Design a protein around this ligand. Structure first.
Ligand SMILES: [Cl-]
Length: 362
């Protein structure tokens, strides 16, 4: 398909950069591209230059605040709070080396849920805040580890403008069997002051992302997760992510077994009747992490409504993250996509419009 921009934003022959996260700032009309650097989190800011309809990426910088002493930082999970304008960067912190506790108990949970916030459009960040105890509580010792995202988080359009952070945890349900992962959501109605841990979806679900859409008559949260099956796993919640209805397989969205691959999903105003449509990116190969494709769902989150994918990039492609960026030069919705490519040797930024990706719609 034709695109507005394709630029490698992170590069490393040593596969130093992985796990992309993208965040669009609507007022500034800029993007924040995060990635893990093999471990800390790095960032590149880029302003959408209207006159040239290109994002001008600035110099890479380390998010020095997004780290705990003696820990490795991973899984950048950003969010823009529309009510306050504050930016949240959730992330995971794990000890850099085996701890004394782990020496005695191999599966002891030593993973930390953290966050740093910014009130100046991501130019500077607050000291890190460990949210582990407040968000997970007593369930903490029941897991071997867990993670959030990777990729952008969600803010609902409810009265409270609730924050929903997608996540997954490896549950130590059997002392002999290896811990099995299950996706879920963290939910806050007060801009991160308090957190609730939602119930798990089906077992063996891993990196997931959530979006909010209108279906039937009200708004629901759709969770789209990586699986070890041949198709993606999806589930919807009518209570902001605290409880999900029965998980379902989305056969139209392929997953390459046995490992599967992380994928991204976002909602955006319908170009036309449903209020929102969904856009999702993930490799399209039946058993390899290759050929990144963009898929559209005009009647979300109905599994049967997903479109055939449009090829965004041929060849090796892995994790990705999407962000809507307002209206494009051609008048249709503008999108930004950050994805791993070329055997993890780089992270590429792609910017395109709905008209470019899905011509038939126009
Ligand atoms: Cl902004």
């Amino acid at each position: 398909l034709p695109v507005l921009q394709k630029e490698s934003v992170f590069q490393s022959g040593a596969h130093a950069y992985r796990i992309p996260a993208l965040l669009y700032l609507p007022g500034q009309q800029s993007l924040l591209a995060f990635a893990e650097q093999r471990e800390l989190i790095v960032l590149r800011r880029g302003d959408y230059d209207a006159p040239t309809h290109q994002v001008q990426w600035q110099a890479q910088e380390v998010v020095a605040q997004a780290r705990l002493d003696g820990h490795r930082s991973m899984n950048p999970c950003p969010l823009y709070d529309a009510q306050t304008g504050t930016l949240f960067l959730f992330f995971i912190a794990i000890p850099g080396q085996v701890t004394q506790e782990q020496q005695l108990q191999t599966r002891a949970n030593v993973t930390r849920l953290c966050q740093v916030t910014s009130t100046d459009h991501g130019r500077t960040w607050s000291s890190p805040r460990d949210l582990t105890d407040a968000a997970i509580g007593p369930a903490y010792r029941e897991w071997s580890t867990f993670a959030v995202g990777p990729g952008h988080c969600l803010q609902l359009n409810d009265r409270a403008r609730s924050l929903v952070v997608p996540a997954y945890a490896y549950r130590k349900l059997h002392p002999i069997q290896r811990p099995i992962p299950s996706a879920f959501c963290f939910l806050s109605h007060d801009h991160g002051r308090t957190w609730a841990r939602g119930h798990f979806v089906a077992q063996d679900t891993l990196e997931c992302q959530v979006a909010e859409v209108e279906t039937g008559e009200q708004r629901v949260v759709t969770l789209n997760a990586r699986s070890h099956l041949r198709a993606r796993v999806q589930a919807q919640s009518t209570n902001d992510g605290l409880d999900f209805q029965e998980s379902q397989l989305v056969k139209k969205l392929v997953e390459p077994p046995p490992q599967g691959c992380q994928g991204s999903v976002i909602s955006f105003p319908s170009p036309r009747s449903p209020a929102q449509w969904l856009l999702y990116t993930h490799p399209t190969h039946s058993w390899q992490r290759a050929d990144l494709g963009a898929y559209l769902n005009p009647r979300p989150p109905a599994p049967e409504a997903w479109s055939e994918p449009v090829l965004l990039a041929k060849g090796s492609c892995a994790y990705s993250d999407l962000q809507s960026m307002g209206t494009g030069p051609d008048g249709s919705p503008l999108f930004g996509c950050l994805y791993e490519a070329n055997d993890y040797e780089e992270i590429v930024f792609l910017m395109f419009t709905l008209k470019q990706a899905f011509p038939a719609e126009y």
